[PDB]
Amino acid sequence: PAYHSSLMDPDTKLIGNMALLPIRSQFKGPAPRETKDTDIVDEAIYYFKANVFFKNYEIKNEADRTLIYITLYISECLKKLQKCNSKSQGEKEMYTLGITNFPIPGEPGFPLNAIYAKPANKQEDEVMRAYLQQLRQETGLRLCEKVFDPQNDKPSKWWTCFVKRQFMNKSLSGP
Amino acid sequence: MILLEVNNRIIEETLALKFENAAAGNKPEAVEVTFADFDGVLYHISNPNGDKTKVMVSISLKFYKELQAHGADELLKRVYGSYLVNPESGYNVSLLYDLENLPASKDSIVHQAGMLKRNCFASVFEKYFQFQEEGKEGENRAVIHYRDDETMYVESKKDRVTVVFSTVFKDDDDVVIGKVFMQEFKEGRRASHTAPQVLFSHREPPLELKDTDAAVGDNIGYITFVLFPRHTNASARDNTINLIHTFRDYLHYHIKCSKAYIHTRMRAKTSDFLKVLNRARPDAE
Amino acid sequence: TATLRPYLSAVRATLQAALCLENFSSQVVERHNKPEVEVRSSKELLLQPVTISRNEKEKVLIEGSINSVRVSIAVKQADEIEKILCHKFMRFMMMRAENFFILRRKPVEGYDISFLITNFHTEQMYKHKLVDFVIHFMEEIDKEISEMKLSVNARARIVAEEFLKNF
Amino acid sequence: SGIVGALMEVMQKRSKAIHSSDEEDFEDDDEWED
Amino acid sequence: EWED
Amino acid sequence: SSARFRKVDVGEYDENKFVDEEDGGDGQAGPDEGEVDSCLRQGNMTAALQAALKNPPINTKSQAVKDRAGSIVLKVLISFKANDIEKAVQSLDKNGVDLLMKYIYKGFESPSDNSSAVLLQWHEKALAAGGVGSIVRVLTARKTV
Amino acid sequence: GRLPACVVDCGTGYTKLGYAGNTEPQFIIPSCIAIKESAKRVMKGVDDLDFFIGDEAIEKPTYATKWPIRHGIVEDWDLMERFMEQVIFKYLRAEPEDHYFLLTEPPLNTPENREYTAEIMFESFNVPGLYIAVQAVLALAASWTSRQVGERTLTGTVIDSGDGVTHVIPVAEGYVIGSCIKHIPIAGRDITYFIQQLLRDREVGIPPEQSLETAKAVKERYSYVCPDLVKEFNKYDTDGSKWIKQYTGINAISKKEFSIDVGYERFLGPEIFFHPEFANPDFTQPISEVVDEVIQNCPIDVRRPLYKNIVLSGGSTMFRDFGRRLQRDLKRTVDARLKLSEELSGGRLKPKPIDVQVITHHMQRYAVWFGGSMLASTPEFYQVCHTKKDYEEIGPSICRHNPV
Amino acid sequence: MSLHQFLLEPITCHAWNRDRTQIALSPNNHEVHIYKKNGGQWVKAHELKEHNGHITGIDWAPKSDRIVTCGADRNAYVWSQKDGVWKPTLVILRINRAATFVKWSPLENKFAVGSGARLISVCYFESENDWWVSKHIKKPIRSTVLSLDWHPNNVLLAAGSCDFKCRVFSAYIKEVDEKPASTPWGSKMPFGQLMSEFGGSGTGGWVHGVSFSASGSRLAWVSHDSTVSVADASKSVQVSTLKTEFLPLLSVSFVSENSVVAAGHDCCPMLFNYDDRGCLTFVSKLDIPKQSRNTALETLHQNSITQVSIYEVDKQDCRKFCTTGIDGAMTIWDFKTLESSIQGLRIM
Amino acid sequence: MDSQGRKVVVCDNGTGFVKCGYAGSNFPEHIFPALVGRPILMVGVNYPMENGIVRNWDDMKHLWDYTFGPEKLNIDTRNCKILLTEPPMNPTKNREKIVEVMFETYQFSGVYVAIQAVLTLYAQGLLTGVVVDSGDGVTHICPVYEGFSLPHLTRRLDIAGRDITRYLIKLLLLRGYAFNHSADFETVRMIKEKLCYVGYNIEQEQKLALETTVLVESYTLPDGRIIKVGGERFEAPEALFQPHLINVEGVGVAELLFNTIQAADIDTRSEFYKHIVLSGGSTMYPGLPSRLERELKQLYLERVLKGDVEKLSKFKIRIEDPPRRKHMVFLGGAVLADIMKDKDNFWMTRQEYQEKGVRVLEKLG
Ligand SMILES: Nc1ncnc2c1ncn2[C@@H]1O[C@H](COP(=O)(O)OP(=O)(O)OP(=O)(O)O)[C@@H](O)[C@H]1O
Ligand SMILES: Nc1ncnc2c1ncn2[C@@H]1O[C@H](COP(=O)(O)OP(=O)(O)OP(=O)(O)O)[C@@H](O)[C@H]1O
Ligand SMILES: [Mg+2]
Ligand SMILES: [Mg+2]
């Protein structure tokens, strides 16, 4: 079957039904600082090429929901990375796309609203907006290093051959 | 496919594949096939003594003594040359091809190796056509048992060559359909003026074919071809030989095809009848 | 249509008189339902057989009961080729007898084809369409046999023409 | 007996000829066990 | 019994 | 051994079976032949026909009497013309009509050349002033002719 | 002296023809027929004798290619009768009155289809004998060359797969348990369409009229079965020189050359046997669960011989590690059940562990034909054939039961 | 002429209640269905299922609303209504072949069942131990009984069977009936006594339908010879026959003292007249064709009519009558509509 | 419900169903299946008895305590009266075991155990006759004279419905449809219960099978396939009259009935001829007793009367099949309870079981 995360810890802070996992980032805010090399962004990039062909996914714990979120946003990163021409313009396009107001759980337009659980408190809404924004910016910055072939500085065919595929027949943006 | 063909497919495909792999430079691979043809002819393609660089094609006939009496060995030697070798046990004529020593054009030898049964049959035809050409008359006829129950007769006159086939139909439906076909063979002279003359007789031998062991049963027909010097001169004669050794099998082939066509028509009519019964239902359709 | 139309009109009128059936359970075996023209156990439930003949070799035999009608047809055969084509056609249709629902696997002796119609077919189909089907079958058989004979002769002419041309 | 014993006998005769006729990038075996 |  | 008990059937040896209501009687020898032959002699066709339809052999259990009675009425039935059939049909009553249907349906059973086709012509005129019930009364009759 | 019998195996994709007593078939042809266009029927003259079969039927102008066999079951019997004319009289060149015949049937075949085949052979070609054979027994008998003497039995499970559906046929003592046969909709035409969608998105320069047979040539040469997906993706990105291969081809209309790169489709092709939701959106069950479900629906006393003898057959089972992947996934499926019965009963259910063995032999590609060729070379083959004399006297009801 | 396509299947038999608002048909299987008329529509109502065979006869009494069903499984049930649901009660028949026809008595204390075991079962009710006791009439009957009818004085019975004869029996049970009066048919009437045995000697066919009169002094039966005949007992017990030219008829009923309506395989009901001197004359077909490949026979029924029953009050005065067919229908004909539509049709 | 006030419960210990009812009732109060489903020991697939022989008595104690519990009866175990039954050719040791269970574990006040042929005849209302009973495996022919069974004259036949089901599997396999014997027992048993019947004259049946297609119909298998049944509808129940088709040596059931009914007293033969009663699940095929009537007519024609044709006419045969085939043993138990209820010494008591020991069953027999 599909591959699941293994970073779950017994004293992990939860937001709704998500897992608020620490990352390695220079963007400011509520994510905790990570000491080890392995975080959830590296595992999502590592499992993206195997997980994108699957049409049925079964939720086992709280790390799977943020894994599905980064797995979708890698695909909406690649749809904009297909038309790029240089690495610096790709980094500028990721800095443009990271601050875009994507819908959250609870709002209409979110695809997996049945599996996910909406938050309640207003400060919970604010920290969920901040956490999703920093996850988006960090996975855009990490994907822009791996997508570019360095000797030519054009996007590779092996990463841009996954444009038309959709995870679980869902899309974070409208068609 | 109206006319039957004279070249065997399996010999040509196997020898073409082996010759292409030999000319490409790859190492050879072992082959051992045994198969059949029309009129109970056995073929064997193998490697002699386990050597994978040589192939050998052998043909076994049940009636090679009668063809040997009319001189098929000189014809086979004159056609093939150095490829003819001593035959193996249980087989009549054997040919040997070496993959190390081959000519540059691998097209003529494969086509000549496909015509081995024809080159076995052609010797009595060439001898009696030469007897008609030289003008010698009074020689005995040739009797060839090409099958177990069927018997072929070849006779030469001063001005014509007569070929008589004796054929047996197993089923009475084949007797009626074969009489229908040979009626059109008999009177079919009125289209083409230059043609060999076809005669047909049912249940009785012809009056020229006398004092022999000719069967008089109800399933046996006799077919007479009359051939002229327009057909038995040299520059045509090979083509004539080709057509005549197909002939009987060709006739039986078309009889079977006629029965298949009848089956197609019956299927269509049966379907139409069922549709009429489907209109008899009180609004269950 | 020298004698074909009065022959078919007489066969149609006799088949209209014969096909009047109803349900009937067996009076010798406890809870059985069998066609009475085949079993022939009782004498009061059988009718007289009738025959309509166009000539010496074409005839239709009709036998009836309280719940079953058997119809036997002899087909006109003039030559040997028409004889073997008719025999092949009747064997072809009687091997597929489970789809026709009103056909017998073996014909009555002296006849070519035979139909057996029970009361369940008259409950499941209209009667006049069944009579029109029997008349349509008897009309279509001879046209099919003549077309097969003409096709065999034309095929034999072309097959002889190609081989005598190729010399 | 039957056709089964003759079929076993003929492929018993044939299998010694087949096994005598056949007389590195995927050599990794250590992953395949559980 | 059944006179009438 | 034992199983020849399955060879003998006892279904026709029962006391409860449909025996026919055969009321015994005779005195049926055809109509007669002589006045029919003289009616054919005198150049008439109708009086021979109502001579032939009288006295059927319905009660006699003899093959030869039924054979000659079905011979004489067929012997007058070939001997007619083409346009007198409707006059000979509507000159009769209903009992003549269904007895003529019985003799015509008996006459189909032994065909002899164009005469059989002549019977077919009679059949359509005997369906003119007749009916399907005449053929029904031919089909279910316990006394054949 | 005696002429050998003819062995003919018909399939959806390929038809295999030859004589008995040979290891390999003499002809492998595509199972298609090209007929003249109707363009509007009456066939005046010899107009039904104008057709081509086999490889020369494919891409002929003013001819329409038709496929008479769909999923093992013959749809049109008029085209199937004309298909057997050119098999006998052009390719095999055998007189049909002298040779016995052996034909094969699909594993779920009606008795009405068995009588239609014997009508064509006996009444249109006049063969003296005919035997219609079950494909599961012949594929099981062809695996005795790899195994030794003591385990040559006739109980096992046969997996047949190519150009159609993939059957799982249990068989015990030479008799097929027909109640437990299950099928998979994934077979060898579905791997070819999956490679064609992967090559269309990535590579450019392939001609549109040649996109199908280049996907077929990639599958037969470069494909294998990967053991794990995410480790295989990591091998290709880190070291692309070892695993990425180049394929070249020639253009039909311009005679020019094109070259492409063969990447992720070397292992993503055969993976849809084990993950059918990659391509088919309706079937989600892997092949290791269906083979386990077929054996569990069998009777109890025959289950342990059925696990020990699993025989692969067909052309789509010719990948590199098909047997090792299926053996590993079956042992996980059984031990999931044997653990779950033990923990629920508190250690009461403690059976012996079973032995699962998947058998791969040399002649997997033509396993049905090779088993039918060895049967027809025996002297006892002529005593289990339906002769023509029984067909004339008894009738067509004799060709309804095939004795083993 | 009001058709209603209930089914696409044959209907074996049907019966009406007293209010003519419910029907009880059988859709050619082992079930009995009841339909209710409301608005302008027929809605399916309570269904009856106890037979494992095939129901051939259904009868409904006018009073006390009890429904008797008999079939080919050699069994008989009496269905009684209670609190919305119908419940069955077993009747032992002591029969071993079949059951073919059933009819209630006019005073609703006995019922008669014809059978294929060459006897007629008269069943009456015993409340001492609460079942139904059957008695047999056997001699002389040599064939399968097809049709029964009850005389309107609760004693005599008319039976037509497959031995080409119609006969009148006297079924009289001493426990459940009073002493009968004298009839013109006979004077001495014990149980099982034959009164008369009419029938065609020589030629003959199976008698499909019998009927009495309102006065009870005239009998009529049809046969398979396409013949209809009326026997009068007052005129020295004589018989008058009529041979028709049409197909055979299956059901018949006196619609008055001197008029009879029949139907059968011709798909069309026909009217015959019987004067007091005694002459059976064909009058007219009731279903005239309208003045207006598909066959499309110009008849409102598309298949054979198997039953004719009266619809308006009783046999004393008729204005409507009903037919059921093999095509599946229920046609109600009107005499006042058919009087004006057909010129010359004078119903008496 | 006598003057002592003890409740009378008639319980039939059948193979598949155990019926809990009381006297005077045409239907019992409780019809419960005798299935003990273990949750891998609740009751209501272990079966305590097969073919009439007890193999486990603790499961009898479990099932009988389920009957004695508050669900079904809740009767007084110390003081009640019950009625039991037992099949023919039963060993007497099992009867000693069950009277040990009734008068040691529970200690009833009245227990009678009897033969189902006598109870079926008392349900019919007739005292003297013969009973042909066929279920699974074993077929009995039992004559009952006055009110008791004759042990010397009753006989057994080994052919029953499981062999008919296996023969139907064999004929369907030779027809062309593949069936496993073990996996598809139940669907071919459903085929046998649905479509099979017994022919009357076997040459007319095989001519009707060969010549015309009026016997064919169709059946739908649960996977979706539809099969057509030929002449096999009369071929499967023909093994009872011809045992050499199923390769079991012996004679048919009609010859067994004739050899039973002839080897008896001369005066008893007439009322054994008029009174034949059929019962059981296998005697349910339409067309069955007329075949036995024809067989006894043919055997009495050839064996006794030698060749006298007219003496066949003075012979009376009546195979009385009941039109109602239902729980007849409970009906006979209710009738036998209603006739006898005051006459207390016909039952055996517990007090007789300590004052006599095991020979109170010897006094019973
Ligand atoms: N390594 C391989 N070698 C050959 N064919 C292969 C291979 N891998 C896949 N195939 C596929 O196998 C298919 C042919 O298989 P096969 O000959 O068994 O089919 P079939 O004729 O339909 O079989 P059957 O006789 O069972 O009906 C082709 O479509 C081909 O693409
Ligand atoms: N309607 C039916 N038609 C034919 N056979 C039937 C029918 N109903 C049941 N059977 C068969 O009868 C047998 C079961 O009958 P029965 O009810 O007597 O069983 P039982 O209780 O196990 O038997 P026993 O009481 O003799 O131990 C089975 O073989 C079953 O297939
Ligand atoms: Mg295939
Ligand atoms: Mg039982």
PDB file of C-alpha atoms in Angstrom, chain B residues 1-2 4-5 7-10 32-38 40 42 62 147 170 174 248-249 253-254 256-257 259-261 263-264 267, chain G residues 1 3-4 19 22 26-27 43 46 48-49 77-78 81 85-86 89-99 119-120 123-126:
ATOM      1  CA  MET B   1      -6.106 -17.830 -51.903  1.00  0.00           C
ATOM      2  CA  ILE B   2      -7.420 -19.525 -55.039  1.00  0.00           C
ATOM      3  CA  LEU B   4      -2.233 -23.542 -53.939  1.00  0.00           C
ATOM      4  CA  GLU B   5       1.465 -22.719 -53.699  1.00  0.00           C
ATOM      5  CA  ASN B   7       6.918 -23.682 -51.755  1.00  0.00           C
ATOM      6  CA  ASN B   8       6.968 -25.017 -48.202  1.00  0.00           C
ATOM      7  CA  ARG B   9       6.816 -22.274 -45.580  1.00  0.00           C
ATOM      8  CA  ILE B  10       8.599 -23.926 -42.637  1.00  0.00           C
ATOM      9  CA  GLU B  32      15.407 -30.184 -34.468  1.00  0.00           C
ATOM     10  CA  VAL B  33      12.035 -30.090 -36.255  1.00  0.00           C
ATOM     11  CA  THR B  34       9.974 -32.884 -37.823  1.00  0.00           C
ATOM     12  CA  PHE B  35       6.861 -32.167 -39.862  1.00  0.00           C
ATOM     13  CA  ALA B  36       4.653 -33.223 -42.765  1.00  0.00           C
ATOM     14  CA  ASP B  37       3.119 -32.055 -46.048  1.00  0.00           C
ATOM     15  CA  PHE B  38       0.496 -33.208 -48.536  1.00  0.00           C
ATOM     16  CA  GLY B  40       2.132 -38.350 -46.644  1.00  0.00           C
ATOM     17  CA  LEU B  42       7.833 -36.493 -44.085  1.00  0.00           C
ATOM     18  CA  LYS B  62       6.568 -43.867 -49.576  1.00  0.00           C
ATOM     19  CA  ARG B 147      -1.248 -42.283 -52.289  1.00  0.00           C
ATOM     20  CA  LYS B 170     -14.734 -40.406 -48.837  1.00  0.00           C
ATOM     21  CA  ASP B 174     -18.068 -34.845 -51.828  1.00  0.00           C
ATOM     22  CA  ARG B 248      -5.893 -33.175 -57.169  1.00  0.00           C
ATOM     23  CA  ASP B 249      -5.224 -31.514 -53.804  1.00  0.00           C
ATOM     24  CA  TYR B 253      -9.387 -27.952 -51.297  1.00  0.00           C
ATOM     25  CA  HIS B 254     -12.088 -26.129 -53.214  1.00  0.00           C
ATOM     26  CA  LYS B 256     -14.059 -28.202 -48.661  1.00  0.00           C
ATOM     27  CA  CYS B 257     -14.264 -24.440 -49.148  1.00  0.00           C
ATOM     28  CA  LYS B 259     -19.035 -26.633 -47.855  1.00  0.00           C
ATOM     29  CA  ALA B 260     -17.788 -23.841 -45.589  1.00  0.00           C
ATOM     30  CA  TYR B 261     -19.625 -21.251 -47.685  1.00  0.00           C
ATOM     31  CA  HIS B 263     -22.481 -23.154 -43.548  1.00  0.00           C
ATOM     32  CA  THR B 264     -22.257 -19.351 -43.567  1.00  0.00           C
ATOM     33  CA  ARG B 267     -26.255 -19.419 -40.099  1.00  0.00           C
TER      34      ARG B 267
ATOM     35  CA  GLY G   1       5.189 -44.133 -40.942  1.00  0.00           C
ATOM     36  CA  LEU G   3       1.951 -38.832 -39.558  1.00  0.00           C
ATOM     37  CA  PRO G   4       2.097 -36.660 -36.416  1.00  0.00           C
ATOM     38  CA  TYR G  19       2.952 -30.530 -35.215  1.00  0.00           C
ATOM     39  CA  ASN G  22       8.280 -30.728 -31.019  1.00  0.00           C
ATOM     40  CA  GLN G  26       6.349 -23.767 -35.719  1.00  0.00           C
ATOM     41  CA  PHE G  27       4.225 -20.627 -36.132  1.00  0.00           C
ATOM     42  CA  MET G  43     -20.853 -12.686 -52.710  1.00  0.00           C
ATOM     43  CA  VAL G  46     -15.182 -16.496 -54.953  1.00  0.00           C
ATOM     44  CA  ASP G  48     -15.100 -15.007 -49.482  1.00  0.00           C
ATOM     45  CA  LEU G  49     -11.698 -16.386 -50.561  1.00  0.00           C
ATOM     46  CA  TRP G  77     -18.103 -18.124 -36.081  1.00  0.00           C
ATOM     47  CA  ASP G  78     -17.983 -17.147 -39.760  1.00  0.00           C
ATOM     48  CA  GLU G  81     -14.200 -20.854 -39.930  1.00  0.00           C
ATOM     49  CA  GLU G  85      -8.900 -22.618 -43.699  1.00  0.00           C
ATOM     50  CA  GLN G  86      -5.636 -20.730 -44.142  1.00  0.00           C
ATOM     51  CA  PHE G  89      -4.051 -25.232 -46.194  1.00  0.00           C
ATOM     52  CA  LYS G  90      -1.388 -22.487 -46.273  1.00  0.00           C
ATOM     53  CA  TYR G  91       0.741 -22.566 -43.106  1.00  0.00           C
ATOM     54  CA  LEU G  92       0.620 -26.166 -41.862  1.00  0.00           C
ATOM     55  CA  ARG G  93       0.026 -27.627 -45.386  1.00  0.00           C
ATOM     56  CA  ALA G  94      -1.572 -30.745 -43.906  1.00  0.00           C
ATOM     57  CA  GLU G  95      -4.232 -32.879 -45.529  1.00  0.00           C
ATOM     58  CA  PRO G  96      -6.999 -32.797 -42.887  1.00  0.00           C
ATOM     59  CA  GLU G  97      -8.310 -36.305 -43.609  1.00  0.00           C
ATOM     60  CA  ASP G  98      -5.069 -37.933 -42.405  1.00  0.00           C
ATOM     61  CA  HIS G  99      -4.210 -35.977 -39.239  1.00  0.00           C
ATOM     62  CA  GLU G 119     -19.246 -29.031 -36.364  1.00  0.00           C
ATOM     63  CA  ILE G 120     -16.535 -27.115 -38.244  1.00  0.00           C
ATOM     64  CA  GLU G 123     -18.409 -31.595 -41.358  1.00  0.00           C
ATOM     65  CA  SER G 124     -16.311 -29.006 -43.213  1.00  0.00           C
ATOM     66  CA  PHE G 125     -12.802 -30.499 -42.996  1.00  0.00           C
ATOM     67  CA  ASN G 126     -13.492 -34.263 -42.386  1.00  0.00           C
TER      68      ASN G 126
END
